[PDB]
Each structure stands twice: as structure tokens, then as C-alpha cells.
Amino acid sequence: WEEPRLILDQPAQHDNINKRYEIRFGKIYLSRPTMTEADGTTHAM
Amino acid sequence: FQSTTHQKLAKALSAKQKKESYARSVVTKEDPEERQRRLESQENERYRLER
Amino acid sequence: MIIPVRCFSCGKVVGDKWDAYLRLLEEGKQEGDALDELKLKRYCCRRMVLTHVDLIEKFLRYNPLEK
Amino acid sequence: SKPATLSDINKIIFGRTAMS
Amino acid sequence: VAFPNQKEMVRPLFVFSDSSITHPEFDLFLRELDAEGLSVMDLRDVDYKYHQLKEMSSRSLSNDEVNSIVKMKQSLSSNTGFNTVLKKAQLQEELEEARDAHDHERVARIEAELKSIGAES
Amino acid sequence: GVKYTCGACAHNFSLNKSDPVRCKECGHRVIYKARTKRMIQFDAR
Amino acid sequence: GNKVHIGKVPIMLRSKFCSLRTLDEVDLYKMKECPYDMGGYFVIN
Ligand SMILES: [Zn+2]
Ligand SMILES: [Zn+2]
Numbered sequence: 001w002e003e004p005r006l007i008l009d010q011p012a013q014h015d016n017i018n019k020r021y022e023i024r025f026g027k028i029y030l031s032r033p034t035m036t037e038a039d040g041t042t043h044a045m
Numbered sequence: 046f047q048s049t050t051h052q053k054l055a056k057a058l059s060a061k062q063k064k065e066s067y068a069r070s071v072v073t074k075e076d077p078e079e080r081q082r083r084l085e086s087q088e089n090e091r092y093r094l095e096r
Numbered sequence: 097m098i099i100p101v102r103c104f105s106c107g108k109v110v111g112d113k114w115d116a117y118l119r120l121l122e123e124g125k126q127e128g129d130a131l132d133e134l135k136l137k138r139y140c141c142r143r144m145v146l147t148h149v150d151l152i153e154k155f156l157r158y159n160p161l162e163k
Numbered sequence: 164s165k166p167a168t169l170s171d172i173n174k175i176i177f178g179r180t181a182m183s
Numbered sequence: 184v185a186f187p188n189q190k191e192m193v194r195p196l197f198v199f200s201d202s203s204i205t206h207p208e209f210d211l212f213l214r215e216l217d218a219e220g221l222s223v224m225d226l227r228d229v230d231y232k233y234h235q236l237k238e239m240s241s242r243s244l245s246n247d248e249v250n251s252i253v254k255m256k257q258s259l260s261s262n263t264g265f266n267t268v269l270k271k272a273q274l275q276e277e278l279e280e281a282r283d284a285h286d287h288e289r290v291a292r293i294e295a296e297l298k299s300i301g302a303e304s
Numbered sequence: 305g306v307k308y309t310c311g312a313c314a315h316n317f318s319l320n321k322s323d324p325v326r327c328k329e330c331g332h333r334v335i336y337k338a339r340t341k342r343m344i345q346f347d348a349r
Numbered sequence: 350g351n352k353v354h355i356g357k358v359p360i361m362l363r364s365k366f367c368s369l370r371t372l373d374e375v376d377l378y379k380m381k382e383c384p385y386d387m388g389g390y391f392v393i394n
Contacts, residue, residue: 032276033360036076039250042073042076077357081354171229176203265312268372
């Protein structure tokens with residue numbers, strides 16, 4: 001949450017349309033450690 | 046100190062900083078990298094089709 | 097790990113007195129009195145039984161590797 | 164089409180240990 | 184399985200004996216087949232069965248087949264200490280997920296299940 | 305040809321240098337070789 | 350817009366997010382962990 005907003009702008013002219021594209025960061029989710037095998041299965045480590 | 050206002054303020058400020066839990070637990074059922082590789086495969090397929 | 101068979105200094109057999117020592121301590125005897133009852137006179141032999149730590153009891157709590 | 168002998172049946176013995 | 188003279192029977196695997204079939208046993212089996220009016224397995228079919236058994240015994244299992252067998256035996260697994268510890272750990276992870284999600288109904292069921300599974304010696 | 309032992313359920317089996325390294329019954333990924341058959345002698349000193 | 354996996358963080362042993370935090374003395378023995386071990390370290394490779 002220190003820098004929660006990435007912003008991209010594009011004043012498209014190709015009828016002027018000023019477009020802002022932005023992504024927000026939300027919650028953090030953690031899990032217990034897991035092990036992923038070569039055959040694709042997973043299990044608790 | 047014995048005033049009720051001071052005791053309530055002390056209780057509120059002491060218990061206010063005790064509650065601190067931002068991260069929420071979750072259960073992983075599959076490989077976390079499965080989405081990345083499947084979307085990379087789809088993107089490579091549509092790149093070949095577009096080419 | 098497990099009680100030595102012989103005293104290191106003189107070689108008296110002390111490996112047959114561990115269970116009797118534990119029994120005597122269970123009955124409420126003091127450690128010195130229990131060692132006196134087991135006829136361990138020299139302090140070299142008393143050191144062997146008084147300072148032994150039974151680590152095999154911890155090693156036996158892990159499940160066996162072969163069945 | 165020939166009948167099976169005792170040795171032929173003995174070749175395909177599948178024990179209880181083998182079953183397990 | 185089915186006796187020739189008798190009728191069909193469903194039997195478990197341990198009933199069979201590792202000892203070889205004796206001569207009077209095979210003779211009685213042949214007499215029962217003749218009484219019912221059946222024949223004996225052909226030598227070509229005997230060789231086909233022998234090759235099938237040798238191929239199955241010398242086959243190398245795949246990862247998916249091994250996982251399927253393990254899941255099947257886990258379904259058959261009544262209890263195993265390592266598996267009970269793993270299940271209890273997974274239940275604890277599910278319980279912390281439910282607690283962090285403020286789900287007061289699921290957590291009670293998980294606690295009851297853990298209480299039923301637990302209380303070891 | 306060579307005996308093994310599972311690291312979890314202590315089950316004995318064999319491998320033919322072509323099967324995946326896994327326990328047959330509980331599917332553990334850790335197995336151990338069995339002790340040899342050669343004679344083992346010590347000098348009790 | 351949902352959960353995106355951003356990486357894996359090593360877990361310190363016997364912490365709140367370790368699997369051994371809950372295990373009691375008996376399951377700790379079944380897991381081949383020493384009860385005298387105190388944690389406070391990571392396992393990398
Ligand atoms: Zn001595
Ligand atoms: Zn196993």
C-alpha cells in the first residue's frame with residue numbers, strides 16, 4: 001500500500017479522447033507452505 | 046486517575062493498538078503458477094494464429 | 097545415552113544398578129542414601145550413576161524405520 | 164485347441180501374495 | 184468365481200491359498216466340467232494368459248496410475264498416524280482461513296471435527 | 305531386484321530401474337535402501 | 350480483477366505461519382521433528 005496505484009495515460013488523437021489506465025493493489029493473502037511435484041499434484045509441506 | 050473518563054480513554058487507547066491483523070489466510074488447492082503457464086500457452090497459440 | 101556397563105575410572109560394573117537406583121529414588125530415598133544402598137563407595141563410581149542422562153528414552157519416541 | 168496340462172496351469176499360478 | 188457343479192460365489196482374495204493345485208483337485212475339477220458339459224482352456228489361451236500375467240507383473244506404472252492407486256488406498260485407509268497429522272494440519276489451515284474470513288459457522292464445525300479426531304495418547 | 309523401504313509407512317517393495325521413486329501404498333516421495341546381506345562383524349572393543 | 354500470485358516468501362520455523370506451531374508433542378515426534386528444536390531459522394534448498 002506504499003505505492004498502491006500504477007497509472008498510464010494516453011491522450012489518443014487518431015476526436016480527442018483522454019484515456020487513463022490505472023490498477024489498484026488490494027489485500028494480501030497468505031497460505032501455509034505447499035509443495036508442487038513434477039506430475040502436477042500438490043500437498044502440504 | 047480515578048475519574049471514569051480517564052479510565053475509559055486509557056482502556057480505549059490501550060485496546061485500540063492491540064488489534065492489528067491485515068493479512069488474511071487462504072488455502073491453496075493447486076499450483077499457483079498454473080494460471081501463468083496456461084495463459085502463456087493461450088497467448089502463444091493466438092500469436093501463432095495472428096502471425 | 098544409556099547407562100555405561102563399567103565405571104570409567106576403576107571398572108566396577110555399574111550397569112546393573114540403574115533400575116534399582118530409580119526404584120530407590122521412587123521410594124523417597126535421597127540420592128546419596130540411594131547410592132549408599134547400592135554399595136557404591138568410591139566417588140568415581142557415584143559420579144557414573146549420579147550424572148548419567150538417559151537419552152535413549154527420547155530416541156525411542158521416534159517411530160521405527162523398519163517393520 | 165489342445166487341452167491344457169498341469170504344468171501349463173502351474174505356469175499361471177498367481178499367489179495371494181502376488182494378488183496383494 | 185463359480186464352481187462348475189455348484190453356483191456362482193463372490194469371495195475375497197485371502198480365501199485363495201498360495202499352495203499349488205494337487206492332482207485329485209484338478210481331476211475333480213475336470214469331472215465337474217464333464218458333468219456340466221464344459222471344456223478346458225485352450226493352450227493358445229493359456230499362453231495368452233501367461234503373457235498377460237508376465238506383462239502385468241513386469242509393467243512399469245506411470246505417475247497418474249500411482250497417484251490413482253494411492254488415492255484408492257487412502258479411501259481404503261481407516262487410519263494412519265502420518266495421514267492423521269497431515270489431515271489435522273490441513274484442518275488447522277482451513278480453520279485459520281475461516282477465522283480470517285469472519286465465518287463464525289464454519290469454524291465451529293471445524294473445531295468439532297478436530298475435537299472428534301484429536302485427544303491422542 | 306533391490307529392496308527398498310518407505311520413509312513414512314515402513315513398507316517394503318522392489319524397483320526395476322523404471323518405476324517412479326514413490327511408495328506403492330501411501331505414495332511417499334522418500335524411500336530408503338534396505339540393509340545388505342553380506343556378513344557384518346565387529347571386534348567388541 | 351482477482352488474486353494474482355506475486356511470489357513465494359520463505360517461512361521462519363515455529364512462527365505463526367509455520368506448520369509446526371500447532372502440532373503438539375506427539376505429532377511433532379511423528380513428523381520427525383525434535384521437541385528441543387526452537388525454530389527461528391529458514392530452510393532454503
Ligand atoms: Zn569407580
Ligand atoms: Zn509408504
